[PDB]
RNA sequence: AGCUUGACUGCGAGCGUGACGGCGCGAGCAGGUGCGAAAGCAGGUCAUAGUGAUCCGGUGGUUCUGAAUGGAAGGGCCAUC
RNA sequence: UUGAGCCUUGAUGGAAGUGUGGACGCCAGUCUGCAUGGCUUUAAUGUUUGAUGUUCUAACGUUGACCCGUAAUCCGGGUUGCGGACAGUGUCUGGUGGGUAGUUUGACUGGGGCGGUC
RNA sequence: GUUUAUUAAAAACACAGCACUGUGCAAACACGAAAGUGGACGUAUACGGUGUGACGCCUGCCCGGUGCCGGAAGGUUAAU
RNA sequence: UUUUGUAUAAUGGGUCAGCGACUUAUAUUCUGUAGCAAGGUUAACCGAAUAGGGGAGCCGAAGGGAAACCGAGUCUUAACUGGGCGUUAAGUUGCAGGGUAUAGACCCGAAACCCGGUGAUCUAGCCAUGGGCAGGUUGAAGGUUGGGUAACACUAACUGGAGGACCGAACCGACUAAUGUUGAAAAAUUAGCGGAUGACUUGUGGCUGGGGGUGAAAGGCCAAUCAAACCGGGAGAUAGCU
RNA sequence: AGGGUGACAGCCCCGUACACAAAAAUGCACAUGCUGUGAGCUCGAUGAGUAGGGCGGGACACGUGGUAUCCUGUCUGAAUA
RNA sequence: UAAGGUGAUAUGAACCGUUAUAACCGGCGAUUUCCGAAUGGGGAAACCCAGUGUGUUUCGACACACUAUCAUUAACUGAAUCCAUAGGUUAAUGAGGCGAACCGGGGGAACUGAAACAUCUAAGUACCCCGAGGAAAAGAAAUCAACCGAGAUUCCCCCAG
């Protein structure tokens, strides 16, 4: 569970990085908050990109 | 019942085995949970009774497909 | 009492004794050894009690076996627990 | 607060003047610095990582309250208060476990038991 | 008062009274793989369990054993 | 029949008739017999279907050694004067029979264990809703009025109508006796007996299920069955016993 | 073949061998109509919470045994011609 | 197809037929009370009671038809919440129950054997359950082989007790 980032957030914050947060840290607040989201691969081209 | 709504896993039958090797009927279940996931290609929480790996695979795949199948497959949800 | 390791390894004609598993006695052959000047004697103790099958496993040895082939594991055999 | 590695805040294969506590220093250096002068133990900043303590909410609980489905003490959804990474559950695991189950508990013998014997 | 319907009605069981003990409520506890239900639409003057058995006068000594309650030290100790 | 031994007063049989217990399959070995012979024979299958085809294969012609391996020898040991097992006699396939193996394996018989069901029309307890208790006693609290107290206390009458209270039918029980014991009756009759406004008794209907129920507790009761109900099943349980 | 007929029937009866028969409905084959379906060539793609591992069981003739292999309740987790 | 028929116990009555509408046999139709999956609600099976539609030169009350549930799809509706969902009505389809074995799957005994008994056996048997077909399942090598080669699955005989 890498994911990318949206907004600041926390020891990590950054608008969008490559980061390896805790599973239940990513699928239980920040995606269901909007400030990650994971990185399937296709998902580390879009923020890869800039 | 104790049926994990993503991986399909449910009770199975096995021994015990005493250092004597007595062997008493017992079942292994699996580690079930029920929880809210988010969506938002919804907008909206779904309570899905999941194992852990279940979980694991929604990681992975990702909801939406997982909730592809299911509705493939016509469980309830 | 002196010197000593025969309380030796491989075998064993022929016997005794057991339902059997087994146990016992044994000259002699081969190799190597001790004591004796030598003929000789010694394969434990004057003899008859002092004991535990098989299985499972340990150890040492062993080119005997080695699941394609080389090895190895494992097994066998010999010794022993 | 705090266990422990690599990066890091520690050390190694403008001269000389005024010169004063500490050094695991068997058993106390008129020597060095304070303003000025032609790829570590004595411990601590960034981490990947345990132990404990506080705080938070966002998984999870709610056999509090209110709302809707709905004229419904079930369930669900919703709002909210409370609780909160506990509780509970799965797998694994040490303890306890006649609550429950399956069984064992020798033969001889002047009947059997007790004794004795094997 | 109750009991062995059909060889035992009693000195047995029960009883009110007594004591210990558990239980703060989503109670302990019981039926139940679970949901749930009883306990109770009760809440410690309540409820369960255990022993004793109206009343009167009373209920002495022993915690070494077994059990239970308490015990943030240390020794031994599972998965990992 | 069983026994050391039975007229035995030890078993079994009232009598007759019918039925009633060593089987079947597949393996293996021996005997007989048949075929062929250092060879014998095919299995499935094909099939013009008991033929014919099919020799995959099995047995035998070589043994010894754990084995590599060697071979009329081989193993043992450095090695046998040796010793152990072998070298000389024929095998094999049918068919009938004797044994054995696996099966219920000669037939009948348990007490039980496991599985799925059916039972609270009896009885135990509980839930709900309805019913019953002739007649006669006792006289609790309380009340009233006099007496009595400073007022209470207290006291006498009268009134009142308490109780797992009293005597006693219905009703509910079941202490004694006799009768009955192939009963009138698989638990009753007669004479006596206990309770009889209560933890009473009763009609209807409901709930609890088998290691489970229920139990004022006897191991009691759960349909004349109870230290684990009944029906069907595993099932021909197993029976070194009769 | 067989049955029946007053007792045992090739020739009494009903059959049997043999040869024939379907107005209708149907099984089965083909042949097409209608519906639904996709064929073909070029260039691509090649099955991850999976394989494997740890714990617990279960399956493989195989009882954890030196035990390959398979399945997975549990926690993990690749390479990609 | 036909000279005889109106099933049997089973006579009798009254009939029907003989050259093709007697009977009898076959194909396809028609009718097909009530209960039972039972399906409009209920229920002590074969009974009680409905809503709505129809129906009457005697247009009342009765008779008939339809109204279960679940699934899929559509349509219309539509909360907390505006969107949107959940919810609700209708409609079209399909399901439901029964049935001998064979088959696959979820569960799964003990007697018994070991001359006792735990491991082991009985045995993945008996039994319960779910599901399906005319067969089921299995199947087109991440298979064997052993350096030579074979070439999905299934069944039979060997290999071999
Ligand atoms: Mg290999
Ligand atoms: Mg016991
Ligand atoms: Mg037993
Ligand atoms: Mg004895
Ligand atoms: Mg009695
Ligand atoms: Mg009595
Ligand atoms: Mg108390
Ligand atoms: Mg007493
Ligand atoms: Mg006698
Ligand atoms: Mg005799
Ligand atoms: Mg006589
Ligand atoms: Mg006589
Ligand atoms: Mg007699
Ligand atoms: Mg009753
Ligand atoms: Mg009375
Ligand atoms: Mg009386
Ligand atoms: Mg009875
Ligand atoms: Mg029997
Ligand atoms: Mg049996
Ligand atoms: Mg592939
Ligand atoms: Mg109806
Ligand atoms: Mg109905
Ligand atoms: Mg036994
Ligand atoms: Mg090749």
New interface residues.
């Given amino acids: 569970?890498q994911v990318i980032l949206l907004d600041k957030v926390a020891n990590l914050g950054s608008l969008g990085d490559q980061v390896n947060v805790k599973?239940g840290y990513?699928?239980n607040f920040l995606?269901?908050q909007?400030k990650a989201v994971?990185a399937?691969k296709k998902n580390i081209e879009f923020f890869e990109a800039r | 019942s104790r049926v994990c709504q993503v991986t399909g896993k449910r009770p199975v039958t096995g021994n015990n085995r005493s250092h004597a090797l007595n062997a008493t009927k017992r079942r292994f279940l699996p580690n079930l949970h029920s929880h809210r996931f988010?969506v938002?290609s919804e907008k909206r929480f779904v309570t899905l009774r999941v194992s852990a790996k279940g979980?694991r695979v929604?990681?992975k795949k990702?909801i939406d497909t997982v909730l592809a199948e299911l509705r493939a497959r016509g469980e309830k949800y």
Wanted: overall charge negative; proline content about 13%.
């Fill in positions: 569970m599973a990513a699928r995606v269901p909007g994971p399937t | 988010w938002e979980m929604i990681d990702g």
